[PDB]
Symmetry: C2
Subunit: 222 residues, 2 copies
């Protein structure tokens, strides 16, 4: 949902930039003013939706100025148009702040996920309550991997999650082989995490191997 907004907002700002540049300081076109206003209003909506407060404030500020400009309360001139460009650039900088946001964020995830895998490992090695715990730890890793676009990690965890959902509810019967496959999945997920930790790409061979094994179990346990 975030990236759709970022792609649209970038496009809108590129449109805003051209319309601002096409403004006639002595006699501005209310149609170009309306275009800049529409693009700013669209960005405001998204910024509010996702809690992009710095962007929200930057947009409100341009909106206000534009509302005076398009209604005729503000006298336009070169200086004012330059201010509008700076507000547009501020909106761009704020958008990029929220678009960016990593490192401290990546590290907190890497550290958190490392710990959750240890918890999963031990609970496997040890009850519906524990199955609910392994399930939720996998659910977090999947969710978080989805957040960072870690497609390979997300998929591995998702396949194990579905098996853990059937295990916790009581739809699927568990045994030593199944548990060892879950432990093997844990090891693969750690390597997937480590590859991303080192800004490398996870092992495709391991991914295909574990996903075949997890889907095999989804059939075998039924």
């Amino acid at each position: 949902f975030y990236q759709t907004f970022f792609d649209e907002a970038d496009e809108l700002l590129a449109d805003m930039e051209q319309h601002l540049l096409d403004l006639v300081p002595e006699s501005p076109d209310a149609e170009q003013l309306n275009a800049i206003f529409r693009a700013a209003h669209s960005i405001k909506g998204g910024a509010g939706t996702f809690g992009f407060t710095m962007l929200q404030y930057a947009v409100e500020l341009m909106e206000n100025m534009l509302d005076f400009a398009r209604r005729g309360e503000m006298q336009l001139n070169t200086d004012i148009i330059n201010l509008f460009l700076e507000l547009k650039d501020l909106m761009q900088r704020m958008l990029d702040y929220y678009k960016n946001k990593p490192q401290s964020f990546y590290q907190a995830f890497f550290d958190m996920a490392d710990v959750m895998l240890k918890v999963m490992e031990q609970l496997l090695k040890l009850d519906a309550a524990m199955l609910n715990a392994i399930f939720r730890a996998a659910h977090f890793i999947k969710g978080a991997a989805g957040t960072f676009g870690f497609t390979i990690l997300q998929e591995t965890t998702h396949l194990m999650e579905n098996l853990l959902d059937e295990a916790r509810r009581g739809e699927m019967q568990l045994n030593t082989d199944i548990i060892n496959l879950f432990l093997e999945t844990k090891d693969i997920m750690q390597e997937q995490l480590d590859a991303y930790k080192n800004s490398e790409e996870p092992d495709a061979a391991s991914f295909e191997y574990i996903c075949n094994a997890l889907r095999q179990l989804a059939l075998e346990a039924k």
Copy 2:
């Protein structure tokens, strides 16, 4: 509201650490388990209140393990106690993530505030709608300065904000002298912003000067 939680949570984690260390692996005390649980539950509440999701997840995980331990579903041993210490450390690391969070955040503020001062400047130099705009720009700077503990910047902006509130509503009559005091306040606020930008302390002489002048106007306009 944030710092009260951070101070309490730090204390709770220090308590948790001692109770975990005082656990008897062969025959644990349900009272020490309850203490660790209470401290974890308290931290969970705050984490939920402020949207500290990474912390929330780290706490849920310890909570779950502790609920098995205190109820007797989990067999304790040295390894399990070490895992509890790691979960406690994770909770500490997550707390510190949310406690920290700056730089990219400081820079976005510095850049945003720089632009808002320019907008304020020009609108002063130029209507209740514009007075509402200068007011809100000051309101943002005050709010944001409050967020970063910039007491001197917050106070300067707050005093001007109250004057801007009376100006926008129509309680206070404005003139050239008042506007020039507002422009002078803008210059002081920029220097206050710049001092913090360079990790320096704002000018105390300017602060006292402008606050006397702003309070003088609060009396003079009435």
